[PDB]
Write a structure and sequence with these properties.
- 4 copies of one chain form a homotetramer.
- Chain A is of the alpha/beta class.
- Chain A has 2 domains: 213 residues, Quinone Oxidoreductase, Chain A, domain 1 (Alpha-Beta Complex), CATH 3.90.180.10; 138 residues, Rossmann fold, CATH 3.40.50.
- Helix content of chain A is 27%, strand content 25%.
- Chain A has 11 helices and 17 strands.
- In chain A, strands 3, 5, 6, 7, 8, 16 and 17 form a 7-stranded mixed beta sheet that branches.
- In chain A, strand 16, helix 11 and strand 17 form a beta-alpha-beta unit.
- In chain A, helix 5 crosses helix 10.
- The radius of gyration of chain A is 20 Å and the shape is globular.
- Chains A and D meet through strand 13, strand 14 and strand 15 of A and strand 13, strand 14 and strand 15 of D.
- The structure holds zinc ion (ZN) (4 copies).
- One zinc ion (ZN) binds next to loops of chain A.
- Chains A, B, C, D: Its cofactor is Zn(2+).
- Chains A, B, C, D: This is NADP-dependent isopropanol dehydrogenase.
- Chains A, B, C, D: It is an enzyme of class 1 (oxidoreductase).
Chain lengths: 351, 351, 351, 351
């Protein structure tokens, strides 16, 4: 089979690989729709995942089951499925401790284009079909469903880790796809005021559509000062770090109130470390909790988010700015995420 | 001054009383708009909290500060305020334990028409003004603001105790004002499917307006069976008990899944046993947690809920089906809550 | 093979059943030491979970692995292991929801002598060995290790569900083995005052040994009245329901403070008699949370508990008052639990 | 009156200063026993205090009430009391938000020698006596009681913030007084293995007395490596940072397992900021939660910890290595905390 892989650091291209085979509990799936992610860019041009050879990229996809192992019981060839980017090995001690995302290792739950060929191929492998797949609703637009696989679950997890209270004020730093879902998730957790930080026009409009009551640009001064002016020197209850460099941590700590919570859902791929401003962090005693984690995956997570979409709790269509038709457009779409044109949020390739 | 009070069990009437005076940290407020509650009915006609003599009723109001003690710093005569129904004594060990609703005693945080003269008077007393009042926004309709003082805070608390997860299925038993806010709150906590139980046309319409995806009527069969039918025998993740008799506890336990949560915000009492069905409760080992608590109050809660309204997180105008004017309408409006006509949700009397 | 089973309600006796067969991921284990439980009694003589036929009893055992399936990697023949009484199917949505105890059904995580042949046989079956077994320390007495399988995990779970705070006062209703572990558990969570309820001398000295600061005997007045006198009418922060009839729920509600938590780990007999007292429960608004659940199981739990014992965090030897040898004595031991002598806590049968 | 104050950065000495007077809700207390703290050192020599002039030092004390305001009801002249180092203003929004430690400002709950004259004076002031004092048991040694004021509440808070589970492995970095209580607290939260990091012989013995199952010294290799060796490459569930510099944060992140929790109770008074290692932190998605907070204060906290001591849950005497008699020894005891002789843990001055 043919697949769009990473020939090597800073190098991409199509390669020829043998079709993956399913174990007794797995499934081989063919993509119906896929979407490039900021991670595919990190992994290649930033070596976020060290070096890799002939590895098929991509981890956001909806598709059709074409083959299932003999022990698979809830899925059969022909089924249309939503594939969460995170597909944990459910039989590990990390799962027993309540952290499937790190089953068998840190971030190990995230297999596609991590240490397992991704979805940008004619076919791809899904471990434990019954535990990691969800049926795609009959009338659901492919472009929308693809947003569930990573954008929705990650953004929403940002709001969950933030332990938002009804009426809490929230600042979302970064208004790209993930940050936009962080805003929507924050609203669906009862957030009162929601301040989105970003400037890309199409993103600013989407941020407001999802719930942002205020928008701040870095170009108008220090974000912390801006936030303080909007909150009359009180600061905000919660901060969700969805984009930017390591400097956003320092900003989150400075604008968040003592006893507040900072939730990171941004994948930091550059630099040796992130810095916590001592004074603003109350010298480590201001109860400004710092959290951060990979989006939950698996069947239950996918079905629950899917149902939120079916019940119109969120309109995912506003995330899709570009739609291509044809496997041949994968390279074009991915390169779109690399150059980051100003009118882009997410791109979906419909085979 | 005059005040509409509970002369005794099953006895109402206007009485003459001495105008309360403000202590160093208190405020005397004159009502601008009030609303009768089912709690007033339970307390009077059912004596759900013991006997009372000459106690002015009502605990839902918006008003004008007419006097403050010498130590009050954030409120002054002339300010328009939202008065939360729960006004705790913030200097108590229960507060240090994290339960303001019970400062100095069970339910003692809720004073108005409990053990303190209520708001159905020319003037009423508010303890610790700086900690228990919130400013009324200039453009906010008085009827809507009154819904914050109890309905919104209680309904949302029901959704808070329920510890709802993104996509959780929820059943709200009782779709009166409290249940309606329970529904709205459930949606604002990320609920996917929301099943409302009730039949009054006006309430059914409001339930769907707030987020109900399904409506069930007792006349179509046992509620538990219906819920099992809608869910293909799987039950629901959460249940919020907002209205109905004590038997709804049994229904909640029977329809909720193991590991699920039942949240009570229904002021029980009456004269019917609160029974937990043993088999359905897993003999006490099915992790079906049961919670239930008086709504949070105080300035912070009022300001946070108020801000949600300002940011259009919820439209409270749908709760008000009747608006009257003048003190000489408090009685009629209260009797309306007793007769419970099919066309009533909440009534507000604007003075 | 031979096995002591429940022929049917009120009927017990040795029978010749089929020998369990190990699937690719299971293990066949031969018991080295077992212990009868009150649960066996409820199940047989009370049909608390439903009638059964020729079901081998017992769910508390330590044993030797004699056979493992072809896919088992961490255990092999010859290994001595601690078998937790709760062995969940780890590949289920309940597990994905965070409740292994109810994998594939309410209480379905607890298989042995629930709907699967128990440990009172020449050999027994353990589903998914790699996920449900733990190595037995070389120097750990068999009698002590058997206490980890259910008594320790259940008692500690009551303490966990109780959400005890540093200094919290706690009442443990019932000082049988489960309550004793509830007491030890409470101390190990930071409890200050710990009031144990019971009268058997042997249990009384064990309770104090585990941390009880006060012991209440029924013959000195009703338990609620005693606790209220000991606490000057203030009640206690937490209540763990370990033993007794269904009236203990009401007693727990009556002595727990507003905002308190009731933790049930008592497998309840029959009826529904789980009545909640309206007034003491603040009409459902006193924030008196009621929790209750089946003990956690699986490999991780058994290893974590095992390590607590190895590090002397709790001395399990005080739970064993009777030790017998040989399969023959399984019947004698079990009947001992039915008669509930005053000198018994737990009995262990070493094969 | 006389008081041992800070005459200026890196300057100490006795001074004459006005004796405080009690507000209507305050009390004036005369010290019975006091103890110098590492904070007194940072404040005077590290200037993390933002510098001050003629400020009386000390915040750890037990004493006698000699005067109360007209509105004080639960404490009267002659009462012996435990004074928590943290004495918040209980009437504030931060308290309503659940964070007394920061009422009216970040760390504002800590008043003594922060922005209010400390306890090293003939008399000192306590705001809101009824909410901020606890009665000192008649038979409790003054030296032990003083350890409750900060060491115990802080160390225990580290264990509380760590949200420890029964059997969790815990590493405590720093075995000075605070870390010693972090170890005791961890044990009292059900920790299995507890690894203490320190080298001072007197502290190492104390560490083992309170529950340390292992002791690691920096002089034997990278602490993370040493921990991995003990844990066979799996790391630990929890880490409590109780001593050392900002490098402990990096070590904490590296040794804790994904999904683990890092609890900081160490006052960081040097450096521009603390650094989080990007890779070890899973690029911000390893669910390695970071917490850090000032110890709780107030009457409830003090009574609850006090009762734990009364019920022998922890023996505080092992923290007191030096005992002096006489006000004139405060300077000597304080300098002891500066020079840090090897046989020191905590010094108490009994007036
Ligand atoms: Zn992605
Ligand atoms: Zn009301
Ligand atoms: Zn048992
Ligand atoms: Zn100190």
């Amino acid at each position: 089979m043919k697949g769009f892989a990473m020939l090597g650091i800073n190098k991409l291209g199509w390669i020829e690989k043998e079709r993956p085979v399913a174990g007794s509990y797995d499934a081989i799936v063919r993509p119906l729709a896929v979407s490039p992610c900021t991670s595919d860019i990190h992994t290649v041009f930033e070596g976020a995942l060290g070096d890799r050879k002939n590895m098929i990229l991509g981890h956001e996809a909806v598709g059709e089951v074409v083959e299932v192992g003999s022990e698979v019981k809830d899925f059969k060839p022909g089924d249309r499925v939503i594939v969460p980017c995170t597909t944990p090995d459910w039989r590990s001690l990390e799962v027993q401790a309540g952290f499937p995302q790190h089953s068998n290792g840190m971030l190990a739950g995230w297999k596609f284009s991590n240490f397992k060929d991704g979805v940008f191929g004619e076919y791809f492998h899904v471990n434990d079909a019954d535990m990691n797949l969800a049926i795609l609703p009959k009338d659901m637009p492919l472009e929308n469903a693809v947003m569930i696989t990573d954008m929705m679950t990650t953004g929403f997890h940002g709001a969950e880790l933030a332990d938002i209270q009804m009426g809490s004020s929230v600042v979302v730093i970064g208004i790209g796809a993930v940050g936009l879902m962080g805003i929507a998730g924050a609203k669906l957790r009862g957030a009162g005021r929601i301040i989105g930080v970003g400037s890309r026009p199409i993103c600013v409009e989407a941020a407001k559509f999802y719930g942002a009551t205020d928008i701040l640009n870095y170009k108008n001064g220090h974000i912390v000062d801006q936030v303080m002016k909007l909150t009359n020197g009180k600061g905000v209850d919660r901060v969700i770090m969805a984009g930017g460099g390591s400097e956003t941590l320092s900003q989150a700590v400075s604008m968040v109130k003592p006893g507040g919570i900072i939730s990171n859902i941004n994948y930091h791929g550059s630099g040796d470390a992130l810095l916590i401003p001592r004074v603003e962090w109350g010298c480590g005693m201001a109860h400004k909790t710092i959290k951060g984690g990979l989006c939950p995956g698996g069947r239950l997570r996918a079905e629950m988010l899917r149902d939120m979409v079916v019940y119109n709790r969120v309109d995912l269509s506003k995330l899709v700015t570009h739609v291509y038709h044809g496997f041949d457009h994968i390279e074009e779409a991915l390169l779109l995420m690399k150059d980051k044109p100003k009118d882009l949020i997410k791109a979906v390739v419909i085979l």
